[PDB]
Design a protein around this nucleic acid. Structure first.
Lengths: 65, 116, 151, 65
RNA sequence: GCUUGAGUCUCGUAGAGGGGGGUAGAAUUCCAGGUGUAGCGGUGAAAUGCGUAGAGAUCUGGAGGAAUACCGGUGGCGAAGGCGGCCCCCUGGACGAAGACUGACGCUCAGGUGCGAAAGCGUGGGGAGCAAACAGGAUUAGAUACCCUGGUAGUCCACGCCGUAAACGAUGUCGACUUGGAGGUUGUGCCCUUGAGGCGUGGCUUCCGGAGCUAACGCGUUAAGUCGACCGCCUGGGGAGUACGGCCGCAAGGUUAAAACUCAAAUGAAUUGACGGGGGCCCGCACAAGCGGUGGAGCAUGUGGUUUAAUUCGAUGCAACGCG
RNA sequence: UUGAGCCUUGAUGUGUAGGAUAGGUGGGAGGCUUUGAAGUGUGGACGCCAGUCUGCAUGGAGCCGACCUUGAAAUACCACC
RNA sequence: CGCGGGGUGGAGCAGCCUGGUAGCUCGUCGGGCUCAUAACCCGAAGGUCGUCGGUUCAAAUCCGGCCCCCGCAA
RNA sequence: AGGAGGUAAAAAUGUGAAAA
């Protein structure tokens, strides 16, 4: 929204956007709602997040290491 | 020309072009910038390099105008977005302010549906 | 060709003085395996470079190499969506061999007088930065640099 | 992950200027409960005070004026 | 007749519950000036569209209609459809600790009745954007196709009407009953409010899974577990949820609902292969880097083609062509 | 105010030869030198990107005309263009 | 009659105010990317640049006159 | 490593009869 710094900037140096969105809300909430499907795409990646959660608990077995 | 100190350059950065005429907060508009008029058609229209060569050719002969530092008001994504005005800072012409006004509504009127 | 690893091997030298890089230049112009013939003529090519310079062996050849020796390499690299030419660095394994392969290719054309008299031209075409070794190299340095976006 | 109503009774109102601006950010966003760890019923009250003070002009609807 | 069923009041809990009325800023954006250079534009690339009167672009000024970014969450409320900024108004239903009150008034339900996404339709408004029907440029062996620039009806509010859906957690409603783990969760009991709580209570909800059950998948205290109340529905597939008739509707159609004939299969779950322009990884000159060339051209062999009494024949997608 | 006509004039003119991006004609031979040079910092009118020219100037007072390859002279000078 | 313009492989369209190239595509031939067909990529036949004449190193182009046509008024 | 940004041209057919 604003990246100025005003005295010592001299370059862009914009990782504020790279750590937040950088194209996020502009390239997604520009159009195309559809009002029906995304929640499943939300939940499937949330199931992947659940799978990311489930795989972190099953780390400690032996692993030969 | 007019020989002033600073100015307010408003950049309408479209998905294809960082359109900016060297403007002011009073409407004084002199120096254009175009991502298609700087050549670079084909795949090169939405390329960052189209904007950067156009932005140096935007600040062309502006030393005679008196203007060195210019208030960038970038609006939209823009093909360059981080080098268009930065090479101008790398060349030396610093920025008084970069106000990246993202025109975010509260989701009012219905938006189109291109790319079916 | 995914994990090819080996140390660099050896080649045949020059029996006049101790020079490995200049002897590597000999093997490139050595074609069809008739090495002895052009090796005698790369010696006369060294002679005819010694008249347009008058300095030395590996200083006349060095000036005939430093105005030709590259630093960068052309390669088509995508960021994922589209292809474009980028100026990327060349490794010195190819670079040392790159410049010497060029003056050989510079003399493979222009076959007006003998091999000495052709490389008379190509070494001074190289010594004064006016050769096909470098003019074609000037095109690569201008086509890659004019479209640098990412590294 | 803070002191809440069970222990830290607190009026979530748009009158108290301090706590009202403690859950906002410069990018035009009320900070969600996913990181701050607030309680949900009070988060709805936390949600309401922003819309309330937006009418009072303590906080705008945008950030650039 | 009492009371654990059920029901009422009390008192607090939360909420896009319903509708009606204002409001505000942003946002594509039209009415134009300022000032201003040649493109804007779009993608696979190009282009019709579009601008030199000065568009894109530029900031200040003016006009709106229609929706509410973050909050927002497998979150809440409602029977479901479905409902989301703010604010007050009339108004829905549920929950909760604990009391007083009538004392089985209940549970389900053919018919009937109401509500009932969107689209469509009727009269009238309203129209900014989006976009059917409709125009064009190209990619194309075809374009009534993606991609691309315009645009009407519709979307719109009010009153009507239709009464269809993957109206679906594909599981009817009611109540009893049967190991748990781990999230979300709001009223709420005790203890040290000592401190981010300890210890529970229940409404409701999410996921993995126990016995059991299930064709299997999986469901799994919100069951598809164990039983009971009662309504509705199916009897192989196509024909067909159509025909005809009744009924309802302005119409579009909805609705109740076959038979003749035809076939001996239709299907569902799960298993092993094959393929995918399904996603990832390892890897052979495949690509990468150069070197040398078949192909050109002058000649030889081989086979086909074209001729001949024979110009044998077998090999002839990859594995035939200096092959036998 | 603009698009033309015409002024005092302001520039500009490469098969090929080339110190020279020379339109023909044309003539005599020094222009030039403090009514302040032969060089260059730098924007840039010219453009067939081949190349000189004008103003300012720390400096500061030098130079070539014919003579030469060219069908033609060398924006040294030059009448009409 | 006169302000103008147009004649270009078998046909269609740029080259013309700037001379140095006689070209862009259709139908025609084959060679290959596919396993076969198709979409596709290259080298080319063939035009008296309307004719004659004149300057120039050289002529489609820059000019003279004539044959043949089309937009308009005598 | 939890969050993130970033990602690729049109490509069609092969009608029959062969399960100890």
């Amino acid at each position: 929204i604003k990246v100025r710094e005003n005295e010592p900037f001299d370059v862009a140096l914009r990782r504020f956007k790279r750590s937040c969105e950088k194209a996020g809300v502009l390239a997604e909430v520009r159009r195309r709602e559809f009002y029906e499907k995304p929640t499943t795409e939300r939940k499937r990646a949330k199931a992947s997040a659940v799978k990311r959660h489930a795989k972190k608990l099953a780390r400690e077995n032996a692993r030969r290491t | 020309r007019k020989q002033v100190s600073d100015g307010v350059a408003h950049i309408h950065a479209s998905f294809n072009n960082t359109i900016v005429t060297i403007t002011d907060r009073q409407g004084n508009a002199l120096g254009w910038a175009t991502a298609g008029g700087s050549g670079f058609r084909g795949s090169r229209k939405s390329t960052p390099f189209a904007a950067q060569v156009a932005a140096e050719r935007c600040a062309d002969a502006v030393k005679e105008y008196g203007i060195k530092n210019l208030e960038v008001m970038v609006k939209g994504p823009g093909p360059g977005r981080e080098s268009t005005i930065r090479a101008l800072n790398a060349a030396g012409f610093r920025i008084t302010n970069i106000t990246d006004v993202t025109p975010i509504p509260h989701n009012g009127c219905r938006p189109p549906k291109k790319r079916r | 060709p995914r994990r090819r690893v080996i140390g660099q091997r050896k080649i045949l030298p020059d029996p006049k003085f101790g020079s490995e890089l200049l002897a590597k230049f000999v093997n490139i112009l050595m074609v069809d395996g008739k090495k002895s013939t052009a090796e005698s003529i790369v010696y006369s090519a060294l002679e005819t470079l010694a008249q347009r310079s008058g300095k030395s062996e590996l200083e006349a050849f060095e000036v005939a190499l430093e105005n030709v020796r590259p630093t960068v390499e052309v390669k088509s690299r995508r960021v994922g969506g589209s292809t474009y030419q980028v100026p990327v660095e060349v490794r010195p394994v190819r670079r040392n061999a790159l410049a010497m392969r060029w003056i050989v290719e510079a003399a493979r054309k222009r076959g007006d007088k003998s091999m000495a008299l052709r490389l008379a031209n190509e070494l001074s075409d190289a010594a004064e930065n006016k050769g096909t070794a470098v003019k074609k190299r000037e095109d690569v340095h201008r086509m890659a640099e004019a479209n640098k976006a990412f590294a | 992950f803070c002191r809440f109503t069970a222990e830290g009774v607190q009026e979530i109102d748009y009158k108290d200027i301090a706590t009202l601006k403690n859950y906002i950010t410069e990018s035009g966003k009320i900070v969600p409960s996913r990181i701050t760890g607030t309680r949900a019923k009070y988060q709805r009250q936390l949600a309401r005070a922003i819309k309330r003070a937006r009418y009072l002009s303590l906080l705008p609807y945008t950030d650039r004026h």
